[PDB]
Symmetry: D2
Subunit: 216 residues, 4 copies
């Protein structure tokens, strides 16, 4: 479990396989016996020559807590499975992403960073109070919730194979992606590296297209 | 172009094929010649016996304007293509879905429907004014936008084949789906029926799983 | 490992999760604690009301040995991952599916079933001898192999989630599917039932569309 | 319609959109008005920076006649739609790919190229005669067909968007792909270039990974 932003997290729930799962699929192997030099070279060969289907046989399930504006970017990754909390069927919790003053580093703002912080807190507080007043007046939850801002936290389970995960890292562990999702992608990368060190290193060396994971 | 909700729309931008596209794919036909009785029966046979791959050769592109809370449900349909306006790269417009008083029919509310309406307007107005104040103070748009509520309108192009479209109609043209997306699904159905009448009628008769399209 | 046909097999290589994986994803649960009555009812509710995305969080990897004509049907299942032996990069083994005389039960043939059996053996033997003569004359393997018949055995790893697996069972564990792939689908079903008994029983009761698994 | 190999073909059956379809989707444009300089630069920007989702809004349907060994490679492309002739439900035609003597250029063979050619013809003739004898004895077609070699011609309709098509060209219009499928990929490229010249040129310049289309 890795903490992200002020109240977010990424947690690994389950994993199928490891580096050897890709090697075994690539060879269609009967062997369930590790030979680092040979297996590692095959992983590098596959990665450097674009043969990534074998990495689809490694699968992760994560539990993620993130603001809706981050989730909407994340859920654009179609080659994966999602299940998310419903604001139709339950009351949504009072939890919002409030950027730290540091979030505005490099931006000259005509009001102080601390005042930006508090103005965001103020509007989310008003919006949640309206949500609650609507709920408490008998407005159905599926309608009441529409006044809640995009920095509201949500949670989801994400099941994804290592190939689609690498695509996600190319796009999201990268400076062009929004900073907030970058932070999530760094945590995803860290877990991927822990479970699949040979694949991760080969990925970085041969296939990774982004500009942050080689710098951290 | 069909108007939906207070400010939304669905518009057909382009289409490839028609009922005969499915028949020709099913037969792997060299013929590019219509025989209603024969072609229509083949469509019904395919539909009633679950052989839906031939309908994937009919493709639509729609332009949709809908609130974000509707779009987030819609974008869960992974077997399709989407491109959506960015709140990272442009200023988002002042346009929100405000439910009509009629939206609360059947719900006894402890405040009048008209007061629910105005309370929703009030909070979206405050949130947008905060968004603008943040933008105008030099806060990057990608951060400023997080205070905007889920009833903010967005727009997207949606490219989808008739098989995935039929899945969308099963799930969204149905009473269990949120009323707001139901309204969009009715418009999608109407366009589908216009362009593919034989497939649509066969769908309704043999494969449609929902409970509204047989009643309208 | 389950033997299929004369020389085929299905073997489970790895699995992620079990019945509880779907329940936990459906609830977006922090709990990693089994409550049969409650969890089983949720599985049945999901299955009977068409909410099958939670079953995507259960994943299998199988190693399959089957004739090419069976593999070509199987590989039409796009929502899954495959890696297969290459006849471009290695010599293919002398192993063919020869139907038993029993395979023709119900068919009056103008030559005896045993003679059908031997005529199939004879032609595959001639084709393989030609393949070998071409290989041994320096014809590249990728070209030599084109003379080999469709009953040649191949092997592949198949990674598939429980939702796509259930689709596969609907279509292939069914009398309309070719008998030879039916036999494979029965083995897949047996493994699925072993690992996911609650999901399998709910599937049979509420969602399974075929006509053999309720009869065996 | 483009002839391929000795008896194969690729034919465009239908297309949705053109270069402007991608531009319009990328901008979520209301405009249905061409501005070459501006639209072409946007296409290049998208292509060079990996933003390829807009090209998914361009869709093709092809009719392809190819040998089974080519089709089995082609059908590995999961992000597309296929419908193919059935050897379960109809008699398969006597049509086989026979390599020309030129196919063996660069390979020293211990029998003459012309003799390789005739040995392939001989075995396919024997296999087809066996197929026919089995059919004519009352063996079901789905069983009789298993003796037919992989160079048997088949036909299919293929519906694919420009993004998946570009992936197909990266992998198949390339020297590592089997020569026979390369020839098909060259024809696909030619049609793609005809219908989408700006996208094709941008693809070649910025995203194409193979080593033949820049040389022809
Ligand atoms: C910096 C940045 C800015 C962005 N800006 C915008 C924006 O302004 N508007 C917007 O709408 N989106 C935007 N996106 C989202 C982007 O367009 C993709 O939806 C997202 O990056 C997921 O990428 P993907 O399609 O590769 O992932 P997945 O959907 O997981 O697809 C994985 C791979 O499968 C293939 N694939 C899956 N489905 C299909 C298909 N139907 N056809 C062809 N290939 C398929 C592709 O090879 C793809 O790479 C942005 C993303 C980034 C990183
Ligand atoms: C009434 C209702 C309530 C809902 N409540 C919730 C909720 O509380 N939480 C929540 O997160 N979502 C919820 N959803 C969304 C739902 O779980 C699906 O994401 C959505 O309905 C799209 O369905 P789909 O997967 O069939 O569509 P698509 O993603 O377009 O898939 C089309 C078909 O392709 C197949 N498919 C595609 N990808 C895969 C894959 N990876 N594995 C296996 N098969 C695949 C399936 O056969 C699927 O039917 C709800 C939907 C409805 C209609
Ligand atoms: C009895 C029988 C006879 C058959 N005869 C023929 C034949 O004569 N010719 C022939 O070519 N094939 C034939 N097939 C194969 C059949 O057309 C399908 O390719 C196969 O059954 C796989 O089904 P699927 O598409 O549901 O599986 P998958 O490809 O695994 O798809 C799973 C689900 O995802 C969705 N999905 C995936 N991709 C797409 C997409 N691109 N668009 C929309 N939805 C998508 C659908 O909801 C689908 O049900 C036959 C199959 C059977 C069982
Ligand atoms: C030279 C060469 C040699 C080959 N040798 C072999 C071999 O020996 N054995 C063998 O079995 N195959 C072999 N193949 C086939 C290869 O492994 C792929 O199946 C094929 O090239 C299609 O590529 P694709 O997966 O990118 O295409 P598609 O299946 O069309 O996928 C398009 C894109 O969508 C994404 N995608 C789709 N589905 C998934 C998923 N489930 N998970 C993650 N991402 C997904 C990926 O981004 C992918 O690039 C070979 C191919 C080539 C070109
Ligand atoms: C997806 C995939 C693609 C492959 N592509 C090639 C290839 O282009 N050339 C090759 O000689 N072997 C290929 N192989 C076989 C094998 O991995 C490789 O030849 C050697 O193992 C490298 O040591 C491939 C295997 C797989 C699973
Ligand atoms: C996807 C698909 C599935 C088919 N399934 C069957 C089948 O189960 N049985 C059959 O006799 N013909 C099948 N056919 C062939 C054909 O459509 C059908 O036999 C007749 O055309 C019905 O008039 C199929 C064709 C396609 C494209
Ligand atoms: C994919 C999915 C779909 C759901 N659909 C519904 C629904 O249509 N109605 C509902 O009341 N709850 C729905 N729920 C919530 C929940 O599973 C259900 O209300 C109760 O748990 C049943 O006991 C859904 C949950 C998921 C994960
Ligand atoms: C899929 C997609 C990705 C985009 N990515 C970026 C980006 O990384 N940076 C950016 O400034 N604009 C991006 N844009 C917006 C726009 O195309 C671009 O800023 C200008 O139009 C370039 O002239 C993107 C648009 C789309 C549809
Ligand atoms: O960095 C980005 C920018 C946009 N998008 C997608 C997500 C959503 O469907 C749409 C608008 O996203 S927004 O730009 O973050 O508002 O485009 C992303 O997925 N990532
Ligand atoms: O009717 C529904 C309910 C939920 N969902 C999906 C959309 C979103 O990813 C998540 C939460 O949606 S919400 O319930 O409308 O808040 O679940 C849907 O797609 N449709
Ligand atoms: O039962 C069937 C019949 C056909 N097919 C697909 C497989 C192949 O791509 C094509 C022809 O298959 S054959 O009918 O077994 O020759 O259609 C299947 O996938 N299953
Ligand atoms: O060039 C290649 C080599 C292999 N394959 C796939 C196709 C088939 O499912 C399997 C074996 O193909 S074969 O090598 O052409 O026999 O791997 C390809 O798709 N392309």
């Amino acid at each position: 479990k890795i903490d992200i932003l002020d109240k977010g997290f990424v947690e690994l729930v389950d994993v199928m396989g490891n580096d050897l799962s890709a090697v075994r699929a690539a060879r269609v192997s009967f062997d369930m016996g590790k030979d680092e030099e040979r297996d590692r070279h095959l992983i590098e060969y596959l990665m450097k020559h674009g043969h990534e289907t074998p990495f689809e046989h490694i699968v992760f399930t994560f539990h993620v807590k993130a603001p809706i504006f981050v989730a909407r970017q994340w859920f654009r990754h179609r080659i994966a499975s999602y299940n998310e909390l419903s604001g139709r069927y339950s009351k949504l919790s009072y939890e919002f992403y409030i950027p730290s003053p540091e979030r505005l580093e490099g931006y000259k703002t005509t009001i102080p960073p601390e005042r930006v912080t508090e103005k965001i807190s103020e509007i989310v507080d008003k919006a949640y109070r309206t949500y609650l007043e609507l709920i408490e007046s008998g407005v159905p939850r599926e309608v009441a919730r529409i006044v809640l801002p995009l920095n509201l936290y949500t949670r989801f389970f994400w099941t994804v194979n290592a190939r689609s995960l690498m695509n996600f890292l190319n796009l999201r562990a990268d400076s062009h992606a929004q900073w907030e999702i970058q932070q999530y992608a760094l945590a995803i990368a860290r877990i991927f590296k822990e479970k699949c060190p040979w694949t991760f290193e080969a990925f970085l060396k041969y296939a990774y297209k982004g500009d942050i994971l080689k710098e951290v």
